[PDB]
Design a protein around this motif. Structure first.
Motif, PDB file in Angstrom:
ATOM      1  N   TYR B  26       3.797 -19.577   2.513  1.00  0.00           N
ATOM      2  CA  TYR B  26       2.849 -20.681   2.536  1.00  0.00           C
ATOM      3  C   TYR B  26       2.533 -21.140   1.121  1.00  0.00           C
ATOM      4  CZ  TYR B  26       1.962 -19.198   7.374  1.00  0.00           C
ATOM      5  OH  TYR B  26       2.099 -18.843   8.698  1.00  0.00           O
ATOM      6  N   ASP B  27       2.245 -22.434   0.992  1.00  0.00           N
ATOM      7  CA  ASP B  27       1.664 -22.985  -0.223  1.00  0.00           C
ATOM      8  C   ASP B  27       0.158 -23.177  -0.113  1.00  0.00           C
ATOM      9  OD1 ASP B  27       4.127 -23.005  -1.364  1.00  0.00           O
ATOM     10  OD2 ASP B  27       4.404 -25.184  -1.327  1.00  0.00           O
ATOM     11  N   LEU B  28      -0.399 -23.083   1.094  1.00  0.00           N
ATOM     12  CA  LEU B  28      -1.833 -23.227   1.308  1.00  0.00           C
ATOM     13  C   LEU B  28      -2.224 -22.444   2.552  1.00  0.00           C
ATOM     14  CD1 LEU B  28      -4.691 -24.840   1.016  1.00  0.00           C
ATOM     15  CD2 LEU B  28      -3.655 -26.326   2.747  1.00  0.00           C
ATOM     16  N   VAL B  29      -3.217 -21.569   2.413  1.00  0.00           N
ATOM     17  CA  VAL B  29      -3.768 -20.822   3.540  1.00  0.00           C
ATOM     18  C   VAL B  29      -5.285 -20.853   3.427  1.00  0.00           C
ATOM     19  CG1 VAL B  29      -4.144 -18.525   4.490  1.00  0.00           C
ATOM     20  CG2 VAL B  29      -1.822 -19.323   4.059  1.00  0.00           C
ATOM     21  N   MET B  30      -5.952 -21.359   4.463  1.00  0.00           N
ATOM     22  CA  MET B  30      -7.412 -21.419   4.516  1.00  0.00           C
ATOM     23  C   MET B  30      -7.851 -20.908   5.884  1.00  0.00           C
ATOM     24  SD  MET B  30      -8.181 -25.073   2.624  1.00  0.00           S
ATOM     25  CE  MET B  30      -9.944 -24.803   2.751  1.00  0.00           C
ATOM     26  N   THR B  31      -8.266 -19.646   5.944  1.00  0.00           N
ATOM     27  CA  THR B  31      -8.755 -19.038   7.175  1.00  0.00           C
ATOM     28  C   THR B  31     -10.273 -19.146   7.205  1.00  0.00           C
ATOM     29  OG1 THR B  31      -6.906 -17.510   7.490  1.00  0.00           O
ATOM     30  CG2 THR B  31      -9.035 -16.891   8.441  1.00  0.00           C
ATOM     31  N   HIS B  32     -10.800 -19.741   8.270  1.00  0.00           N
ATOM     32  CA  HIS B  32     -12.235 -19.908   8.438  1.00  0.00           C
ATOM     33  C   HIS B  32     -12.622 -19.487   9.846  1.00  0.00           C
ATOM     34  CE1 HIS B  32     -16.141 -21.968   9.017  1.00  0.00           C
ATOM     35  NE2 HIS B  32     -16.283 -21.760   7.720  1.00  0.00           N
ATOM     36  N   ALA B  33     -13.732 -18.763   9.953  1.00  0.00           N
ATOM     37  CA  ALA B  33     -14.255 -18.314  11.235  1.00  0.00           C
ATOM     38  C   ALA B  33     -15.375 -19.252  11.664  1.00  0.00           C
ATOM     39  CB  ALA B  33     -14.760 -16.874  11.147  1.00  0.00           C
ATOM     40  N   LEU B  34     -15.173 -19.942  12.781  1.00  0.00           N
ATOM     41  CA  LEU B  34     -16.163 -20.886  13.268  1.00  0.00           C
ATOM     42  C   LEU B  34     -17.279 -20.159  14.013  1.00  0.00           C
ATOM     43  CD1 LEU B  34     -13.804 -23.725  14.567  1.00  0.00           C
ATOM     44  CD2 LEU B  34     -15.041 -23.618  12.392  1.00  0.00           C
ATOM     45  N   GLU B  35     -18.393 -20.871  14.201  1.00  0.00           N
ATOM     46  CA  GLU B  35     -19.524 -20.302  14.926  1.00  0.00           C
ATOM     47  C   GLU B  35     -19.145 -19.971  16.364  1.00  0.00           C
ATOM     48  OE1 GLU B  35     -23.571 -21.276  13.796  1.00  0.00           O
ATOM     49  OE2 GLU B  35     -23.844 -22.194  15.772  1.00  0.00           O
ATOM     50  N   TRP B  36     -18.418 -20.863  17.021  1.00  0.00           N
ATOM     51  CA  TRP B  36     -17.979 -20.678  18.394  1.00  0.00           C
ATOM     52  C   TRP B  36     -16.528 -21.118  18.507  1.00  0.00           C
ATOM     53  CZ3 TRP B  36     -20.670 -17.965  21.862  1.00  0.00           C
ATOM     54  CH2 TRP B  36     -22.049 -17.821  21.669  1.00  0.00           C
ATOM     55  N   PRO B  37     -15.795 -20.593  19.490  1.00  0.00           N
ATOM     56  CA  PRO B  37     -14.398 -21.006  19.667  1.00  0.00           C
ATOM     57  C   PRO B  37     -14.280 -22.495  19.950  1.00  0.00           C
ATOM     58  CG  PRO B  37     -14.832 -18.984  20.870  1.00  0.00           C
ATOM     59  CD  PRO B  37     -16.161 -19.485  20.390  1.00  0.00           C
ATOM     60  N   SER B  38     -13.194 -23.084  19.456  1.00  0.00           N
ATOM     61  CA  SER B  38     -12.913 -24.502  19.631  1.00  0.00           C
ATOM     62  C   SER B  38     -11.683 -24.670  20.512  1.00  0.00           C
ATOM     63  CB  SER B  38     -12.692 -25.187  18.280  1.00  0.00           C
ATOM     64  OG  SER B  38     -12.504 -26.581  18.443  1.00  0.00           O
ATOM     65  N   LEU B  39     -11.829 -25.437  21.591  1.00  0.00           N
ATOM     66  CA  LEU B  39     -10.706 -25.730  22.470  1.00  0.00           C
ATOM     67  C   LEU B  39      -9.870 -26.909  21.992  1.00  0.00           C
ATOM     68  CD1 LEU B  39     -12.296 -25.246  26.022  1.00  0.00           C
ATOM     69  CD2 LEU B  39     -11.141 -23.582  24.554  1.00  0.00           C
ATOM     70  N   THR B  40     -10.377 -27.707  21.056  1.00  0.00           N
ATOM     71  CA  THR B  40      -9.670 -28.881  20.567  1.00  0.00           C
ATOM     72  C   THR B  40      -9.774 -28.945  19.051  1.00  0.00           C
ATOM     73  OG1 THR B  40      -9.592 -31.305  20.574  1.00  0.00           O
ATOM     74  CG2 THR B  40     -11.729 -30.261  20.971  1.00  0.00           C
ATOM     75  N   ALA B  41      -8.805 -29.627  18.443  1.00  0.00           N
ATOM     76  CA  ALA B  41      -8.791 -29.819  16.999  1.00  0.00           C
ATOM     77  C   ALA B  41      -7.962 -31.052  16.684  1.00  0.00           C
ATOM     78  CB  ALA B  41      -8.218 -28.593  16.282  1.00  0.00           C
TER      79      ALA B  41
END
Lengths: 380, 405, 197, 380, 197, 405
Positions: B26-41
């Motif tokens: 990878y040239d870019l990795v940004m892992t973020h944990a959201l408050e609640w699961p997201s079914l769409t993006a």
């Protein structure tokens, strides 16, 4: 695209007459050379900052010239720097391994034989032949390795204010103040084509209305720097006049290799007269084409170029009729020279008011570069 | 039993090894944990480039999946470094031999707008003619339409939402939703009610709040999994359903019970479809066969090709907006596969064929759960945002040497 | 561009919108598609033509607004000092940004030039021993002057020996001041008047 | 206090030799006059912005001078502008009711009689008498109303680089390049006091160790502009040397009216030599006094002044021994002249590098002005 | 300056603190005060000495930090045009700011030069009729160019006829673009190539 | 009955006429309505001058008086135009003939820090050696000490405060509080328990939270209304009590039940006192006599003078920090009187004497209720902030032609 006009004078507020990037660079940072009336040739380092605005770092100063330096050109390999001026001597500089210099340059060859100011210089593709235009009504072809003149063209009747070399090694084009374009055969060493007059349709009384293509002495620019296409297919000559209505209009003529005595077309530039033409050395993949006979030439690739008039720069490509870019009113006096970078990300513009400017493009903004540069059908 | 523990251990080890190998891929990795699961993006078309700054700001439309809490439609901001800033000789680590150093430069991910939403946000899609208008699919029979400029930046103190438009055409919840890119206001939705509903919100009065269904198509005999407009034709649109069928409908056709064209696309449920942005004839459909079928609109009887490197069901397939030969597919196997069309039917070395078919280009295995939904960035090439079930959102980009070479 | 009861989208000062189309508009295109939709002739093979030409691509979204980006630079950079003689930056490639939510260690922003033959994009979980130890990384946690026009003139006048001036100003310090800093008081006492009798 | 250094050259990057505010102003906005080597005297409008930073507006240009203008001084009423230069002629300008001028000025009187460059000019309190110092070793007193020379002092042996006029109308002080301070009686029209030598303690063997007070030709400034106190009590003469130990130290001497042949004190300026002295025209109420014999003079009021050396400005008042302000390293070359504003809110400094600067003070920062300005006990 | 368990006060970048004392420190003062505290001699009258001298005052708080305020100006103001010929601002006094919480009408920021002989500071409620109507006010609701160094040089070269340049840049407009503005498209069509045959 | 209605009508008419006459008497008027009434008001020594701006930012410490709500110690920000910006030829009104116009330039008043506080904030005073430390008087027997840099900018979700220090010396509530400007950490408090308590918090450990009384003075026989340290002596301090007495105490005196000096200051309760900043011998005491008595420490038997222009009880008297001859006094008569010392005993014209004694300089009658507390601005001369009972805070400055002339 972004436009960055420099607010600090490069040559002590004296006019800047020429600009050229180091074509031998293959990275992201480039080397630029500027000539001025202050008898100095200054070499700078140009690169983009974190935001995308061009930043200029001073590298070296070359003060061997005694009078104003009018033209500065880099060799195709970027190893030899040609500088011509009012002293009628062309200096060839090279990097060698003086308090103000970060890096040092020294004169290798002193090409002599001109009698007046040198206005334009053009290299050959192999880098072993050079061509220069001067005020003395002569265009001189020099042997770079021997450092001596090899041919002289004295067919001009006034100042010779532009010379370009065919990338296919067949012709040399000169533009003079006598409103005459000359094309010399590289093998015969004589005049191959003369382009001075032009007819415009049929006259009112059935006559053959014929005028002169190019501008008179009224032009405020010393230079008429025409240019060949990097592939060599087309020839772009600025400082042209077209009698559209009852008054003439400034334009840049576009000629083909198939016939050099009549241009394919003309790009009109209402307002001031065009003086410089410089082509981007990057071959781009064709844009999504709306099918029309609009293209100047029909080849699988396209090429971006710039035409600089007295107070504006027009950015054209091969296939479109209208220019895709237009910049104007960034300098208080006449522009002098334009130069593209090796990667096409920079377009340096110089003007006689003493300040220069840059036109920068983001990644693949001009287009998608070809995977492999097309092979040239050299004449030699 | 032991199944959960073994799966957790294996997935944790796989995530650890993937994180260790991430610099090479990878040239870019940004892992973020959201408050609640997201079914769409979905990536918003907005990109703000502040002058004098080394980054750009993109926006994302996401949902929330709360079991018993207040659900939210979310618009979030992601900072991505500028291309000109990716070359920087700031520091030189004489030990590791790189122009590295962790420093303080980091990607900034923050939530900008939160809007109340009754029920889970199954899928949220903005209107291309107006990014201010966002359509959301609820677990109810109605489809909601919001304008985030007409709502407070912070949610209401309590209570459910006040949607700008409510469209009532279905009888059950659904997941397929698509705006018409050629006709402003035309929205298509698909649900478990075996029907596809078309609304025209281009004539809603200022005080109007409820819009009835303009058209209902009942060709499918099973749960209509997905529906998508054609990117160049204002009349044709495709749909894939649980009946192993892909149907091409013409809005000019008066028959609302029989599609203009029908194709037995797969051998099991087909969950998604997407049209190629550069070719008006080519589309792709992801199925439960662990397959992605390529379809030519000029020859629907013959399947152009079948991508067969997935290990479980496939739920989302989207084309790259910057390359016609690049395709992407995600599913329950916690993997995001990127495929090259120009490598179909090419010879392969015996050990290279062990990894997969020649058309497979890249594998993203940074997700420890089912990838709920992914989306290509329309502004930055090769940048993909993927949200999974374990409230994990990852905005990533594979290495340049993988596709450019 | 107002659709129904919704106002048209408002583009901010420095906003850019991704293009809505990726191909030039062909007038008869749709009509032709309709024909190709009804003929259902399998004479056309798209995959065959894919390998015979270059893939259709597009670049990153750029600004195209009229008079959008116009800037002025009043600074020339002058570099002095040999420094450490670090290798060429150009040969180190792009700086990669690797950040993780669960990592206590801050985000990584730097290049990566390690070379392997086993860590493939086709297999992210492919191990490469003897070069990378697979243990948890997160366990614990010369001069380049920017001369203005006047400074550039002074540098040209002097040369490498020139240095930019550092103005030294001391605020109003009085004998009656009680909270005034003592260092400034002593610096000004250095100029104390000397009387003669 | 704030320091605002101007980044734009007022006289085409040529050295600026003199500055003076319009003393006749009684408001918040001030008029400033600058002289340079470009043979131009430029008048500007200076006022503070909303934030407190000084802003300069160009008003007029006076190009009647043929050579470099060295000294510019305003009359006490601010109505007549005196300009002296290398042409040995002093021009008196007035406002009358030339494309670049917002307001117009014209020459009223051309004072002639000098043989070389004029370096300093001082007005009298009544405004009907003027005094000028020149390179020709003469200090000339002029009748302003009659526009003719009234007296010549030729007792100097070198260039006369500073002249000040007593506010009480009794003495005229001249500083010359011969390391000699001269005080002429205004009524006798002869030399009243000579101050050249100075003794420093006892020798080592009782000898009378006596050296020269003032600097030699090594001074880098053309000017030695001494000044009287606005009340007239004290006389401040820059470019002084004190042999404290085995080495000399630069200083500004402070003399009293009671005896003019020996200074009260000297303000030391280690480093470069002091060249200019300018006093603030505002009488300030005394600070809360810590009782000591520190004051230069014991009067109910106090006066702030500035001493400008080659590369620094020291801000003193009457009662304190140490200066309350110090600014340095704001100009790349020698300072030329300093001038206070009418209200005391501005201190303009000019330097030979071509750029000027301002020192601004907030409301009542220098002190509390007196309710009524004290009446002067003039001699006449 | 740490008192107890509390850290010393942190002065911000542009903060100023009012002086803690308003008088110079006299060493023996306290001692004398102590004597004057016990003597209780009525020989001293402060009100008598008040009228025989000037009141002790102090000015507004100013900055006195070392190298605090040092600025550079790169602009010269050139004013062109007669304008309206408004009266002298200096003769209009300070601009008063009068704002009220209950006023729907916005705050007043302007001078006040009306003159009366009845509205005294000694009596705020003193009415002045025939000049001021006592009704509720809140019932319902040429060129100055800032030339840079280069522009200043050009102005000196030309004069009053000189005007600063307004750069005109048109972004990348392509024939395939669909959302590109039509104004830029026509401006670029003004330079359309003309072919000859 | 009719008394309340008549008083309300008269006060409304008086406020209307005062607002109409305000341009002639003030150069700055800023009326702001606070969330809750403030019993205390003090200017902080901080003034932030942002470069490139036409204003400065001052800070104020205030309290809240809620009958049954959560009480807060408040630190608020006030924007005041710079002196150089007060001269501006922006617009010229050709009708009114002034360089005026309401425009958009206005003073910005906002709440910066809110901290929980158990009970009403009787009086809050910051420590001069450290403006971060603020001492507050509660309706309880304890005095609280806060450090607003150690507390969140927003109040706690619920519950009472978490004071940094708790000082327990009294048995009842109080209102008099003053830090020692010469000894850091020395705090004096006065309460209804007839005693004055002195604390020394300069030796508190890091984990310490409760400080006992260092000294207790019991000279007064009534409610000790106010106490104040001497501005130049680290040992002497004055106090005024309900027993019509002003006492000067020396901390070096071993007798904690008898002051070093006692004065029968007034004929009724004395509510406040303040020392002159420029003279070590002069102080002022405001009484219930509607009087302000001037006292010389060198002659305590004789009252220097009595200012007698107030119409009701006087609760606060403060000296001007920029002028020794300027005094201010506020009380229940809804008026703030400013007096000039240098005009005492001057001849007066017959109509001028109708307004009041010659020493009276200015009257501020913009408050419709009792002025709870006022404070001079130590950074901007002649700027006074006064808070009244009807949750009204006014930061004002009288006209320049009144004091300068």
């Amino acid at each position: 695209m972004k436009v960055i006009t420099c607010e600090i004078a490069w040559h002590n507020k004296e006019p800047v007459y020429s600009l050229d990037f180091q074509h031998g660079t293959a990275g992201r940072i480039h080397r630029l050379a500027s000539a001025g009336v202050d008898t100095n040739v200054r070499i700078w380092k140009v690169e983009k900052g974190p935001d995308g605005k061009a930043i200029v770092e001073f590298l070296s100063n070359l003060a061997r010239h005694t009078k104003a330096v009018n033209v500065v050109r880099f060799s195709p390999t970027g190893e030899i720097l040609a500088s011509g001026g009012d002293d009628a001597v062309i200096l060839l500089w090279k990097v060698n391994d003086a308090q103000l210099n970060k890096e040092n340059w020294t004169v290798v060859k002193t090409l002599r034989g001109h009698l007046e100011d040198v206005y334009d210089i053009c290299w050959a593709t192999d880098g072993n032949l050079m061509a220069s235009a001067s005020v003395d009504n002569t265009a001189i072809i020099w042997d770079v390795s021997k450092g001596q003149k090899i041919s002289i063209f004295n067919e001009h009747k006034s100042y010779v204010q532009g010379v370009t070399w065919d990338p296919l090694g067949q012709y040399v084009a000169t533009l003079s103040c006598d409103r005459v374009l000359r094309v010399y055969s590289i093998q015969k060493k004589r005049v191959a084509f003369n382009v001075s007059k032009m007819l415009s349709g049929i006259g009112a009384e059935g006559e053959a209305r014929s005028y002169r293509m190019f501008h008179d002495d009224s032009m405020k620019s010393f230079f008429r720097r025409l240019s060949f296409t990097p592939d060599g297919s087309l020839l772009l000559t600025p400082a042209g006049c077209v009698e559209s209505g009852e008054n003439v209009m400034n334009t840049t003529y576009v000629f083909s290799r198939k016939n050099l005595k009549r241009p394919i077309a003309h790009l009109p530039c209402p307002g001031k007269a065009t003086l410089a033409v410089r082509c981007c050395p990057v071959y781009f993949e064709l844009r999504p084409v709306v099918e029309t006979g609009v293209e100047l030439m029909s080849l699988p690739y396209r090429l971006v170029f710039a035409v600089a008039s007295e107070d504006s720069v027009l950015l054209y490509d091969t296939q479109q009729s209208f220019p895709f870019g237009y910049v104007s009113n960034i300098h208080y006096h006449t522009l002098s020279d334009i130069s593209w970078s090796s990667d096409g990300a920079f377009l340096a513009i110089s003007s006689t008011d003493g300040y220069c400017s840059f036109v920068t493009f983001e990644k693949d903004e001009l287009g998608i570069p070809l995977k492999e540069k097309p092979v040239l059908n050299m004449r030699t | 039993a032991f199944d959960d523990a073994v799966e957790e251990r294996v997935i944790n080890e796989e995530y650890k090894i993937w994180k260790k190998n991430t610099p090479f891929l990878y040239d870019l990795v940004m892992t973020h944990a959201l408050e609640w699961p997201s079914l769409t993006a979905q990536w918003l078309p907005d990109v703000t480039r502040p002058e004098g700054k080394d980054f750009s700001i993109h926006r994302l439309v996401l949902g929330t999946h709360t079991s018993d809490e207040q659900n939210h439609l979310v618009i979030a901001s992601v900072q991505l470094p500028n291309d000109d800033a990716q070359f920087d000789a700031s520091h030189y680590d004489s030990e590791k031999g790189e122009f590295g150093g962790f420093g303080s430069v980091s990607g900034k991910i923050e939530i900008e707008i939160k809007i109340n939403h009754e029920g889970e946000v199954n899928r949220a899609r903005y209107m291309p003619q107006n990014p201010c208008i966002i359509a959301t699919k609820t677990p109810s029979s109605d489809v909601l339409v919001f304008d985030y400029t007409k709502h407070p930046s912070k949610p209401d103190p309590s209570g459910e939402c006040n949607p700008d438009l409510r469209l009532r055409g279905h009888q059950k919840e659904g997941y397929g939703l698509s705006w018409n890119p050629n006709l402003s206001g035309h929205l298509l939705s698909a649900s478990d009610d075996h029907t596809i509903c078309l609304w025209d919100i281009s004539a809603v009065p200022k005080e109007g709040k409820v819009v009835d269904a303009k058209t209902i198509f009942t060709g499918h005999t099973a749960v209509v999994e997905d529906v998508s407009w054609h990117l160049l034709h204002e009349s044709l649109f495709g749909s894939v359903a649980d009946d192993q069928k892909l149907m091409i409908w013409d809005t000019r056709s008066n028959n609302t019970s029989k599609p203009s064209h029908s194709v037995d696309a797969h051998t099991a449920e087909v969950n998604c479809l997407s049209f190629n942005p550069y070719s008006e004839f080519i589309l792709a459909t992801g199925s439960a066969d662990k397959t992605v079928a390529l379809w030519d609109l000029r020859n629907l009887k013959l399947k152009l090709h079948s991508f067969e490197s997935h290990k479980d069901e496939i739920f989302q397939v989207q084309w790259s907006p910057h390359n016609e030969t690049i395709l992407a597919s995600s599913g329950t196997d916690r993997r995001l596969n990127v495929w090259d069309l120009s490598k179909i039917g090419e010879e392969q070395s015996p050990e290279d064929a062990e990894d997969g078919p020649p058309e497979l280009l890249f594998i993203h295995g940074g997700h420890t759960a089912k990838i709920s939904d992914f989306s290509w960035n329309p502004n930055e090439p090769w940048v993909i945002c993927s949200v999974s079930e374990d409230n994990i959102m990852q905005v990533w980009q594979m290495a340049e040497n993988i596709y450019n070479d | 561009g107002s659709c129904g009861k919704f106002a048209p989208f408002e583009i901010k000062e420095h906003m850019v919108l991704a293009p809505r189309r990726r191909t030039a508009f062909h007038p008869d295109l749709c009509s032709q598609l309709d024909q190709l939709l009804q003929q259902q002739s399998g004479e056309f093979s798209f995959l065959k033509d894919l390998k015979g030409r270059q893939p259709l691509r597009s670049g990153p979204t750029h600004v195209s607004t009229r008079n959008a980006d116009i800037f002025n630079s009043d600074v020339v950079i002058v570099e002095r000092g040999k420094g450490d003689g670090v290798p060429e930056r150009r040969k180190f490639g792009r700086m990669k940004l690797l950040q993780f939510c669960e990592n206590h260690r801050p985000a990584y922003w730097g290049t990566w030039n390690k070379k392997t033959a086993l860590i493939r994009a086709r297999d992210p979980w492919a191990q490469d021993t003897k070069l990378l130890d697979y243990e948890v990384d997160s366990d614990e946690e010369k001069v380049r002057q920017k001369l203005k026009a006047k400074e550039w003139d002074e540098f040209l006048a002097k040369g490498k020996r020139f240095r930019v001036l550092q103005p030294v100003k001391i605020g109003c310090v009085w004998a009656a001041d009680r909270d005034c800093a003592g260092d400034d008081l002593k610096v000004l006492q250095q100029f104390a008047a000397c009387f003669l009798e």
